[PDB]
């Protein structure tokens, strides 16, 4: 099965300039060459060039709405096409607002997909409930059917069409939710495993339930949107919104080793790596290294080892 | 239900001067304003002023006996009164010797209470078995009935009356016990989950057993005495007696999210925060922050989120 | 039961000069005096003096064949003798190539023994599959029956005779295996718990299965070969081949508290402590301290406490 990488060096969903240098640090760490070592074929589409929208006034409280919308509508066109040619898309970005295009474009081709959203945040604030004008906590509000017509249309997102329902997404690692967001997840009946649920069941029992929830009835493609801040700041410090008490390096890997075993991984997101926020060089390398290990695990690199087939090593 | 905070800036139970600045660092970190954001009513009794006892000679090996005894008899009078008016007491202290007054005064009003003692130490040395004259590892020896008349009366503690039995207390996080203490817990049949028990069962299974042990037969108020050193030195470094291999930030929170769900939390202790022992400013803030998060969790702040009731966020 | 310590300051199994100062740093940390505090009798055989072999030409790709072989044949003569006199051998070494003599000499006396191999590596490369001429990842290939005659005889190892079968060894902590090694463990049917298995079952469930696997049918002596690099680089940094995502200080201890409870610990190995690779003094002390705590736990030091018998502390 083919794998195609797509760079999304975009950072208008957040105050923090810097995340536009993420695909570059990842690529700079051997991400593309290591992928060729698996049993997959890798092609580097290359970074996208988002055309800046001038005089992009703020919509009420939301910042850079049109720049984020047009830049997203663009990832959408690229993902759908690559999905079209039966290939797995791996988007290296930028802040998490790029999940609007990455997930919608994926659903155009595979409308029966489900979403595993590993994050310390629910990123489900609507244009109204936000305390900031930051779109990095709103992507999911633009993707859910149940949330359509619940908030005024944001200039730049009329091309989006809520594709997945609150029932086709699962949250993993939550530990920082806004009163608004929590009220939404409780009202919509969204399946989630916050840090306390993970403490109770153990990552193993968790992954084993999300699969019988999403894949229980009918097997379907899986979209894996990974926000580096789902892991504790000790492993992935280079993120703009780190929160203590996160998933560990080991649990991080476990989620990706299990999602591979399903043979359903259709789309992948590695968001929020900001190389300019590592207080010291050590921190960044740490964030980039664990980010590369998560991507490799989604495509075969297991912790027990790996020996090429039809080969007798003796 | 009402919550009433009580500052106990006392440090005569230990060599280490410094823990008298704890209630101040916690209050300085938003502890009282954050509490007002829950569904409880908070009232700040303020710090107590312990009158120093002159010529407080040592009793055998025990240090400052009368200063610790009179200072304790004082917390006792304050807790009982606040408990009286049907309010939950939250004592910000000092070293852990202040658990004598905090727990005895609580039992005067609620004699059927049980004690959950999260700590890396059993603090059950009697005046004889101690290797030091430090009362921070003796509080529990003054509170157990089974240990009355087992050691000579220490000048200053004749006002105490062993209230709870070895069967109404449970230990969580033990990983540093004295030959004397371990012998006592094995002879009295005290229920405990040392670090190895937590490794075996997982914090979840643990909390689920201590509740069927203490609350199994009859439901009764719960006293939660939290010694910051129960958590690994990585999360709460600012403690005079740190021990590697402790409960984690995540497990720490889990214990407090579970004790809330019971609806029984009657008394709370946040002991051993010593703002003057954090090698760097980072360390203290880290100790104070996790200390605040533990207190907020005992009163509703969950990791899955929180949305005020009778409020439609859409 | 008697305990006898044996220093193996050897480092010809690796490029990295330095591990010959391990027994010295451990002894320098109170390892021998702390052991006398348990209910065992400790005797310090002292360090061995390995006679260097001159003109020790490389065998194909393997380095210092004869120096490693003759130095091993020597540990073999010392372990067997001490085992003979019904004593528990505790070898402080060197790189992990010294497990050839330590395990073979143990089997001469107890041929029905089983091996618990805690390591981040399988150290099962044969002289052919290695990418290096390093013997610190080949010890197990010289000890298995099933692997005899599968590779040319290495000058210096004619004295060894594969004693245990692939079915009498269990791996704990694997997270760095070579295509060659993994192929071998899958072909021989060797029982192992890689880091992902430990994440799934929890250390507790793991130790509970390795015991019903090795000790299920017949009870027999146990050989415990501990490679400090089985623990994450945070706890034991002073190792030549550290790998992220390791067992923790807590899990490390749990494995040793459980192996004691069996009453079968016959032989112990504490390999790979290299005092000269700790970037800062903090790192070494950290490696040595956790190394001492693992040895003490294998002989009684529990985390719940310890009170001498027939003693009334009241
Ligand atoms: Mn996000
Ligand atoms: Mn996030
Ligand atoms: Mn204490
Ligand atoms: Mn303590
Ligand atoms: Mn090894
Ligand atoms: Mn190793």
Beta bridge partners of B4: B43, B89
Place of tokens 């008394």: B267
Backbone phi, psi, residue A226, to 5°: -100, 110
Place of tokens 């600012």: B238
Asked if the C-beta of B280 comes within 8 angstroms of chain A's C-beta atoms, the answer is no
Q: Are B196 and C254 in contact (CB under 8 A)?
A: yes
**CB within 8 Å of chain B, chain A residues 227-256:** 244-245
Q: What is the DSSP letter of C118?
A: E
Domain with A246, as residue range(s), is: 1-314
End-to-end CA distance of chain C: give it in Å, rounded.
29
Q: Are A43 and A114 in contact (CB under 8 A)?
A: no
Select the residue of C202, C257, C307 nearest B183 (Cβ to Cβ). C307
Asked if the C-beta of B146 comes within 8 angstroms of chain C's C-beta atoms, the answer is no
Select the residue of C253, C290, C304 nearest B174 (Cβ to Cβ). C304
Distance CA A273, CA C153 (A): 51
CA count, 13 A, side-chain hemisphere, C161: 6
Which tokens belong to B133?
A: 């004259």
Vertex B38: Cα angle to B33 and B44 (nearest 5) = 40
Characterize B88-109 residue by residue with b for buried, 16 or more Cβ atoms within 10 angstroms of its Cβ, and e for exposed.
bbbbbbbbbbbbbbbbbbbbbb
Which tokens belong to A56?
A: 């992009």
Select the residue of C129, C181, C199 nearest A305 (Cβ to Cβ). C181
Q: Are B61 and B85 in contact (CB under 8 A)?
A: no
Three-state DSSP state, A191: strand
Which tokens belong to C97?
A: 């190539």
The structural domain count of chain C equals 1
Long-range contacts of C279-287 (CB under 8 A, 24+ apart): C279/C237, C283/C237, C283/C238, C284/C25, C284/C238, C285/C29, C286/C235, C286/C236, C286/C237, C286/C238, C287/C228, C287/C235, C287/C236, C287/C237, C287/C238, C287/C239
Closest alpha carbon within chain B to A126: B314
Please judge whether A183 and B303 are an interchain contact, meaning their C-beta atoms are less than 8 angstroms apart. Answer: no
Residues 6+ apart with CB under 8 A from C192: A304, C122, C170, C171, C172, C174, C185
Give the Å distance between the CA of B232 and the centre of ligand 1: 29
CA C299 to chain centre: 16
Say whether A3 counts as a known binding-site residue.
no
Contacts of A198 in chain C (CB under 8 A): none
Beta bridge partners of B174: B194
Contacts of B314 in chain A (CB under 8 A): 126, 150, 184, 187
Q: What is the DSSP letter of C105?
A: H
Closest ligand (CA of A117): 1
How many angstroms away from the CA of B295 is the closest CA of chain C?
A: 26
How many angstroms away from the CA of A34 is the closest CA of chain C?
A: 15
Which tokens belong to B282?
A: 């980072």
How big is chain A, counted in residues?
314
Technique behind the model: X-ray
End-to-end CA distance of chain B: give it in Å, rounded.
29
Q: Resolution reached, in Å?
A: 2.7
Residues 6+ apart with CB under 8 A from B271: B93, B94, B95, B96, B98, B99, B225, B226, B227, B228
Beta bridge partners of C225: C117, C269
Give the helix/strand (H/E) hosting B207.
helix B195-214
Distance CA B229, CA B235 (A): 9
Distance CA A249, CA A297 (A): 12
Which tokens belong to B114?
A: 């049980």
Closest alpha carbon within chain A to B314: A150
Distance CA C145, CA C168 (A): 11
Nearest to A238 by CA among A248, A247, A227: A227
Asked if the C-beta of B182 comes within 8 angstroms of chain C's C-beta atoms, the answer is yes
CA distances C240 to A304, B48, C14, Å, are: 20, 55, 9
| Residue A175's CATH number | 3.40.800.10
Contacts of C192 in chain A (CB under 8 A): 304
Strands (E), A23-105: 41-47, 88-92
């Amino acid at each position: 099965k083919p794998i195609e990488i797509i760079g999304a060096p975009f950072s208008k969903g957040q105050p923090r300039g810097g995340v536009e240098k993420g695909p570059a640090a990842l690529r700079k760490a051997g991400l593309v060459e290591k992928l060729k070592e698996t049993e997959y074929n890798v092609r580097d589409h290359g970074d996208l060039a988002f055309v800046d929208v001038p005089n992009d006034s703020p919509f009420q409280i939301v910042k850079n709405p049109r720049s984020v919308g047009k830049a997203n509508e663009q990832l959408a066109a690229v993902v759908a096409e690559t999905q079209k040619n039966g290939t797995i898309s791996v988007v290296l970005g930028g802040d998490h607002s790029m999940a609007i295009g990455s997930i919608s474009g994926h659903a155009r081709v595979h409308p029966d997909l489900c979403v595993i959203w590993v994050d310390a945040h629910t990123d489900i604030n609507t244009p109204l409930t936000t305390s900031s004008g930051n779109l990095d906590g709103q992507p999911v509000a633009f993707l859910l059917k149940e949330l359509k017509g619940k908030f005024p249309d944001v200039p730049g997102f009329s091309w989006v069409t809520p594709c997945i329902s609150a029932k086709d997404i699962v949250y993993i690692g939550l530990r920082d939710v806004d009163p608004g967001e929590h009220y939404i997840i409780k009202t919509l009946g969204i399946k989630y495993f916050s840090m306390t649920e993970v403490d109770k069941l153990g990552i193993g029992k968790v992954m084993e339930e999300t699969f019988s929830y999403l894949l229980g009835r009918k097997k379907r493609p899986i979209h894996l949107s990974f926000d580096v801040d789902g892991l504790d700041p000790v492993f992935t410090p280079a993120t703009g919104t780190p929160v203590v008490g996160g998933l560990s390096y080991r649990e991080g890997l476990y989620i990706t080793e299990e999602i591979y075993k399903t043979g359903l991984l259709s789309g992948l997101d590695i968001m929020e790596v900001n190389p300019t926020l590592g207080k010291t060089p050590e921190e960044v390398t740490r964030t980039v290294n664990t980010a590369v290990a998560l991507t490799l695990s989604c495509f075969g690199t297991k912790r027990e080892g790996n020996h090429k087939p039809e080969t007798d090593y003796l």
